[PDB]
Ligand binder design. Structure first.
Ligand SMILES: Nc1ncnc2c1ncn2[C@@H]1O[C@H](CSCC[C@H](N)C(=O)O)[C@@H](O)[C@H]1O
Length: 257
Protein backbone atom coordinates (compact mmCIF):
# COMPACT_ATOMS: atom_id res chain seq x y z
CA UNK A 1 0.00 0.00 0.00
CA UNK A 2 1.46 3.37 -1.07
CA UNK A 3 2.21 5.25 2.16
CA UNK A 4 3.43 8.67 3.26
CA UNK A 5 6.93 8.36 1.80
CA UNK A 6 5.42 7.52 -1.61
CA UNK A 7 3.19 10.62 -1.50
CA UNK A 8 6.00 12.90 -0.35
CA UNK A 9 8.44 11.68 -3.02
CA UNK A 10 6.08 10.95 -5.91
CA UNK A 11 2.62 12.64 -5.73
CA UNK A 12 2.65 15.34 -8.42
CA UNK A 13 -0.19 17.86 -8.03
CA UNK A 14 0.03 18.91 -11.69
CA UNK A 15 -0.53 15.30 -12.78
CA UNK A 16 -3.38 14.95 -10.26
CA UNK A 17 -5.09 18.09 -11.58
CA UNK A 18 -4.64 16.93 -15.20
CA UNK A 19 -6.23 13.55 -14.42
CA UNK A 20 -9.25 14.61 -12.30
CA UNK A 21 -9.72 18.36 -12.78
CA UNK A 22 -8.60 19.05 -16.37
CA UNK A 23 -11.35 21.57 -17.26
CA UNK A 24 -11.12 20.48 -20.90
CA UNK A 25 -14.78 21.43 -21.44
CA UNK A 26 -15.74 17.91 -22.56
CA UNK A 27 -18.51 15.66 -21.24
CA UNK A 28 -16.59 13.34 -18.91
CA UNK A 29 -16.98 11.10 -15.83
CA UNK A 30 -14.29 13.12 -13.98
CA UNK A 31 -16.28 16.31 -14.64
CA UNK A 32 -19.44 14.57 -13.39
CA UNK A 33 -17.71 13.58 -10.16
CA UNK A 34 -16.71 17.20 -9.57
CA UNK A 35 -20.28 18.30 -10.33
CA UNK A 36 -21.73 15.79 -7.86
CA UNK A 37 -19.44 17.08 -5.13
CA UNK A 38 -20.20 20.71 -5.95
CA UNK A 39 -23.93 19.92 -5.78
CA UNK A 40 -23.58 18.13 -2.42
CA UNK A 41 -21.46 20.97 -1.05
CA UNK A 42 -24.00 23.62 -2.10
CA UNK A 43 -26.76 21.66 -0.32
CA UNK A 44 -24.55 21.25 2.76
CA UNK A 45 -23.16 24.80 3.06
CA UNK A 46 -25.67 26.97 1.17
CA UNK A 47 -28.89 28.59 2.45
CA UNK A 48 -30.46 26.46 5.21
CA UNK A 49 -27.30 24.39 5.66
CA UNK A 50 -24.40 24.28 8.08
CA UNK A 51 -22.81 27.49 9.37
CA UNK A 52 -20.20 28.38 11.95
CA UNK A 53 -16.96 30.12 12.72
CA UNK A 54 -14.26 27.63 11.83
CA UNK A 55 -13.86 24.92 9.23
CA UNK A 56 -10.86 22.63 8.70
CA UNK A 57 -10.39 20.85 5.37
CA UNK A 58 -8.31 17.68 5.74
CA UNK A 59 -6.42 16.19 2.79
CA UNK A 60 -7.15 19.21 0.59
CA UNK A 61 -4.68 18.06 -2.07
CA UNK A 62 -3.98 20.82 -4.59
CA UNK A 63 -7.72 21.59 -4.93
CA UNK A 64 -9.95 24.45 -3.75
CA UNK A 65 -13.36 23.48 -5.26
CA UNK A 66 -14.38 21.78 -1.99
CA UNK A 67 -14.64 25.08 -0.07
CA UNK A 68 -16.39 27.28 -2.67
CA UNK A 69 -19.80 26.81 -1.01
CA UNK A 70 -18.26 26.65 2.46
CA UNK A 71 -16.76 30.18 2.38
CA UNK A 72 -20.27 31.67 2.50
CA UNK A 73 -21.03 30.01 5.83
CA UNK A 74 -17.64 29.61 7.59
CA UNK A 75 -15.45 32.72 7.88
CA UNK A 76 -12.24 30.98 9.02
CA UNK A 77 -11.10 28.13 6.77
CA UNK A 78 -7.99 25.97 7.20
CA UNK A 79 -6.69 23.88 4.28
CA UNK A 80 -4.30 21.03 5.03
CA UNK A 81 -2.51 18.23 3.25
CA UNK A 82 0.09 15.59 3.91
CA UNK A 83 1.99 16.29 0.67
CA UNK A 84 4.34 19.32 0.59
CA UNK A 85 3.94 19.82 -3.19
CA UNK A 86 0.15 20.03 -2.73
CA UNK A 87 0.42 22.71 -0.05
CA UNK A 88 2.69 24.66 -2.43
CA UNK A 89 -0.02 24.53 -5.16
CA UNK A 90 -2.69 25.75 -2.71
CA UNK A 91 -0.47 28.67 -1.69
CA UNK A 92 0.10 29.63 -5.37
CA UNK A 93 -3.68 29.89 -5.82
CA UNK A 94 -4.26 31.81 -2.56
CA UNK A 95 -1.43 34.22 -3.40
CA UNK A 96 -2.56 34.67 -7.05
CA UNK A 97 0.94 33.68 -8.20
CA UNK A 98 1.65 33.08 -11.93
CA UNK A 99 1.56 29.26 -11.55
CA UNK A 100 -1.88 29.18 -9.85
CA UNK A 101 -4.27 26.60 -11.28
CA UNK A 102 -7.32 27.98 -13.09
CA UNK A 103 -10.47 26.89 -11.20
CA UNK A 104 -12.81 29.26 -13.06
CA UNK A 105 -15.19 26.60 -14.53
CA UNK A 106 -15.73 25.15 -11.01
CA UNK A 107 -16.17 28.62 -9.43
CA UNK A 108 -18.74 29.45 -12.13
CA UNK A 109 -20.61 26.17 -11.55
CA UNK A 110 -20.62 26.77 -7.79
CA UNK A 111 -22.13 30.25 -8.41
CA UNK A 112 -24.63 28.83 -10.93
CA UNK A 113 -25.95 26.59 -8.12
CA UNK A 114 -26.54 29.75 -6.10
CA UNK A 115 -28.55 31.29 -8.94
CA UNK A 116 -25.91 33.52 -10.59
CA UNK A 117 -22.74 32.22 -12.31
CA UNK A 118 -21.75 35.84 -13.09
CA UNK A 119 -20.59 36.54 -9.53
CA UNK A 120 -17.66 34.10 -9.91
CA UNK A 121 -14.84 36.60 -9.26
CA UNK A 122 -16.58 37.68 -6.05
CA UNK A 123 -16.78 34.04 -4.87
CA UNK A 124 -13.17 33.33 -5.89
CA UNK A 125 -11.92 36.27 -3.79
CA UNK A 126 -14.30 35.50 -0.91
CA UNK A 127 -12.85 31.98 -0.62
CA UNK A 128 -9.29 33.27 -0.94
CA UNK A 129 -9.98 35.74 1.92
CA UNK A 130 -11.59 33.05 4.12
CA UNK A 131 -8.59 30.68 3.91
CA UNK A 132 -6.46 31.74 6.89
CA UNK A 133 -3.76 29.06 6.87
CA UNK A 134 -2.42 26.07 4.96
CA UNK A 135 -1.06 23.30 7.22
CA UNK A 136 0.58 19.90 7.14
CA UNK A 137 -1.78 17.12 8.23
CA UNK A 138 -1.67 13.35 8.77
CA UNK A 139 -4.98 11.63 9.56
CA UNK A 140 -3.21 8.79 11.42
CA UNK A 141 -2.11 11.15 14.18
CA UNK A 142 -4.37 11.60 17.24
CA UNK A 143 -4.16 15.30 16.44
CA UNK A 144 -3.96 15.27 12.60
CA UNK A 145 -2.51 18.84 12.59
CA UNK A 146 0.29 18.21 15.14
CA UNK A 147 2.39 20.14 16.08
CA UNK A 148 -0.24 22.79 15.27
CA UNK A 149 -3.08 22.77 17.80
CA UNK A 150 -6.11 24.64 16.55
CA UNK A 151 -9.16 25.49 18.66
CA UNK A 152 -11.92 22.86 18.41
CA UNK A 153 -13.73 23.53 15.12
CA UNK A 154 -17.34 23.85 13.97
CA UNK A 155 -16.72 21.72 10.89
CA UNK A 156 -14.17 19.26 9.54
CA UNK A 157 -14.34 18.73 5.77
CA UNK A 158 -12.59 15.89 3.91
CA UNK A 159 -13.06 14.76 0.30
CA UNK A 160 -11.45 11.83 -1.52
CA UNK A 161 -8.38 11.66 0.79
CA UNK A 162 -9.18 9.35 3.73
CA UNK A 163 -9.49 6.29 1.45
CA UNK A 164 -6.04 7.17 0.00
CA UNK A 165 -4.41 7.79 3.39
CA UNK A 166 -5.71 4.58 5.01
CA UNK A 167 -4.53 1.08 4.09
CA UNK A 168 -7.44 -0.79 5.75
CA UNK A 169 -10.94 -0.44 7.18
CA UNK A 170 -9.37 -0.43 10.67
CA UNK A 171 -7.07 2.47 9.68
CA UNK A 172 -10.07 4.33 8.22
CA UNK A 173 -12.11 3.77 11.41
CA UNK A 174 -9.30 5.17 13.60
CA UNK A 175 -8.74 8.11 11.22
CA UNK A 176 -12.41 9.11 11.64
CA UNK A 177 -11.92 9.25 15.41
CA UNK A 178 -8.85 11.44 14.81
CA UNK A 179 -10.96 13.84 12.74
CA UNK A 180 -13.63 13.79 15.44
CA UNK A 181 -11.00 15.02 17.94
CA UNK A 182 -10.75 18.28 15.92
CA UNK A 183 -14.45 19.08 16.44
CA UNK A 184 -16.45 20.84 19.12
CA UNK A 185 -19.21 18.67 20.56
CA UNK A 186 -22.14 19.23 18.15
CA UNK A 187 -19.68 20.04 15.33
CA UNK A 188 -20.01 18.42 11.92
CA UNK A 189 -17.92 16.20 9.71
CA UNK A 190 -18.61 16.58 5.99
CA UNK A 191 -16.97 13.93 3.83
CA UNK A 192 -17.11 12.37 0.39
CA UNK A 193 -15.69 8.89 -0.07
CA UNK A 194 -15.33 6.81 -3.25
CA UNK A 195 -16.59 3.26 -2.84
CA UNK A 196 -15.02 -0.14 -3.62
CA UNK A 197 -11.89 1.57 -4.98
CA UNK A 198 -8.59 -0.38 -4.72
CA UNK A 199 -6.26 2.11 -6.47
CA UNK A 200 -6.18 5.30 -8.54
CA UNK A 201 -3.94 6.85 -11.19
CA UNK A 202 -2.16 10.18 -10.81
CA UNK A 203 -0.93 10.71 -14.35
CA UNK A 204 1.02 7.53 -15.16
CA UNK A 205 1.61 6.64 -11.49
CA UNK A 206 -0.63 4.30 -9.47
CA UNK A 207 -1.46 4.96 -5.81
CA UNK A 208 -3.36 2.62 -3.47
CA UNK A 209 -6.82 3.03 -1.98
CA UNK A 210 -8.73 1.11 0.64
CA UNK A 211 -11.80 -0.46 -0.98
CA UNK A 212 -14.76 0.48 1.24
CA UNK A 213 -18.46 -0.37 1.06
CA UNK A 214 -20.88 2.33 2.15
CA UNK A 215 -22.24 0.08 4.93
CA UNK A 216 -18.69 -0.11 6.34
CA UNK A 217 -18.21 3.66 6.02
CA UNK A 218 -21.56 4.27 7.72
CA UNK A 219 -20.72 1.93 10.63
CA UNK A 220 -17.27 3.58 10.95
CA UNK A 221 -18.88 7.02 11.22
CA UNK A 222 -21.30 5.90 13.96
CA UNK A 223 -18.44 4.13 15.79
CA UNK A 224 -16.35 7.36 15.75
CA UNK A 225 -18.97 9.08 17.95
CA UNK A 226 -21.09 10.71 15.23
CA UNK A 227 -24.61 10.28 14.07
CA UNK A 228 -25.47 10.67 10.37
CA UNK A 229 -27.35 13.92 9.63
CA UNK A 230 -27.36 13.76 5.80
CA UNK A 231 -26.22 11.12 3.31
CA UNK A 232 -26.14 11.57 -0.46
CA UNK A 233 -25.13 8.64 -2.65
CA UNK A 234 -24.51 8.52 -6.40
CA UNK A 235 -23.55 5.58 -8.62
CA UNK A 236 -21.25 7.99 -10.54
CA UNK A 237 -17.86 6.49 -11.38
CA UNK A 238 -14.62 7.85 -12.80
CA UNK A 239 -13.08 6.48 -15.98
CA UNK A 240 -12.13 2.91 -14.95
CA UNK A 241 -8.65 3.60 -16.37
CA UNK A 242 -8.20 6.27 -13.68
CA UNK A 243 -10.16 4.85 -10.76
CA UNK A 244 -12.54 1.90 -10.89
CA UNK A 245 -14.93 2.95 -8.12
CA UNK A 246 -18.46 1.70 -7.42
CA UNK A 247 -20.14 5.06 -6.87
CA UNK A 248 -19.63 7.65 -4.18
CA UNK A 249 -21.09 8.73 -0.84
CA UNK A 250 -21.27 12.21 0.73
CA UNK A 251 -21.97 12.20 4.48
CA UNK A 252 -22.77 15.00 6.90
CA UNK A 253 -22.27 13.70 10.44
CA UNK A 254 -22.76 15.37 13.83
CA UNK A 255 -20.36 14.76 16.71
CA UNK A 256 -22.57 13.70 19.59
CA UNK A 257 -22.26 15.88 22.75
N1 LIG B 1 -1.87 10.45 5.97
C1 LIG B 1 -2.50 11.41 5.26
N2 LIG B 1 -3.19 12.41 5.90
C2 LIG B 1 -3.85 13.40 5.20
N3 LIG B 1 -3.83 13.39 3.82
C3 LIG B 1 -3.17 12.41 3.17
C4 LIG B 1 -2.50 11.40 3.86
N4 LIG B 1 -1.95 10.58 2.94
C5 LIG B 1 -2.25 11.03 1.70
N5 LIG B 1 -3.00 12.17 1.83
C6 LIG B 1 -3.57 13.03 0.79
O1 LIG B 1 -4.73 12.45 0.23
C7 LIG B 1 -5.03 13.23 -0.93
C8 LIG B 1 -5.75 12.34 -1.93
S1 LIG B 1 -6.31 13.19 -3.43
C9 LIG B 1 -7.73 14.13 -2.80
C10 LIG B 1 -7.47 15.64 -2.94
C11 LIG B 1 -8.68 16.59 -2.77
N6 LIG B 1 -9.25 16.56 -1.39
C12 LIG B 1 -9.78 16.40 -3.82
O2 LIG B 1 -10.96 16.57 -3.48
O3 LIG B 1 -9.52 16.10 -5.00
C13 LIG B 1 -3.68 13.80 -1.42
O4 LIG B 1 -3.75 15.21 -1.40
C14 LIG B 1 -2.66 13.26 -0.42
O5 LIG B 1 -1.58 14.13 -0.11
Amino acid sequence: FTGGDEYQKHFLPRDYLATYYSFDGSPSPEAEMLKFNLECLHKTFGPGGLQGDTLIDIGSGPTIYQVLAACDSFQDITLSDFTDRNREELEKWLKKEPGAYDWTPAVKFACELEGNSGRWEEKEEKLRAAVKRVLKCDVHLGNPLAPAVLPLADCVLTLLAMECACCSLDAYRAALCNLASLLKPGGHLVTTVTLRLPSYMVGKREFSCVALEKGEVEQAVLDAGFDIEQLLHSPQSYSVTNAANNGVCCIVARKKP
